[PDB]
Structures are given as C-alpha cells and as structure tokens.
C-alpha cells in the first residue's frame, strides 16, 4: 500500500502537537532554534537555554516552525 511513497518518511515533528524542547541555538533574527533529534524547529518566541513546550504549527521542507505554548 503506497501512493508513490509511504508518507513523507515520517517527520520527527508532528504538526498539531506540542513538545518540550531546548533552545540551545539562536538565529540571526532573534529566533530560537529548537532541535528534536537534530530536526531544526524554529521558535519565534522561545528564549535561549530554556526548556520550552512548543507546538509545531508549520512543518516545511527542511525544517519546522513551532510556537511557545508557555
């Protein structure tokens, strides 16, 4: 059972769910970079070094965008 390919190879981050992540990295625009298993999850409203609960709202081609549910 495959419509071309089986899903998108399972994205580690599921849009519509919220995960506790760390903001070990910051971007060149005051954006916080969470990383789930290495998957870069951009968080526009997270603080660096904090463990924040982020709702992945927009998974893109090579990365996803989340939001601070805090």
Automatic annotation (TrEMBL):
PROSITE patterns: TRAM (PS50926)
Residue ranges annotated for the TRAM domain, each copy included: 12-69
Coiled-coil stretches noted in the UniProt entry, renumbered to this chain: none
The name this protein goes by in its record: TRAM domain-containing protein
Organism: Methanococcus maripaludis (strain DSM 14266 / JCM 13030 / NBRC 101832 / S2 / LL)
UniProt lineage: Archaea, Methanobacteriati, Methanobacteriota, Methanomada group, Methanococci
């Amino acid at each position: 059972m495959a419509f071309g390919k089986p899903a998108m190879k399972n994205v580690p981050v599921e849009a519509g769910k919220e995960y506790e992540v760390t903001i070990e990295d910051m971007g060149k625009g005051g954006d916080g970079i969470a990383r789930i298993d290495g998957f870069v999850v951009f968080v526009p409203n997270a603080e660096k070094g904090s463990v924040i609960n982020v709702k992945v709202t927009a998974v893109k081609e090579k990365f996803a965008f989340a939001e601070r549910v805090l």
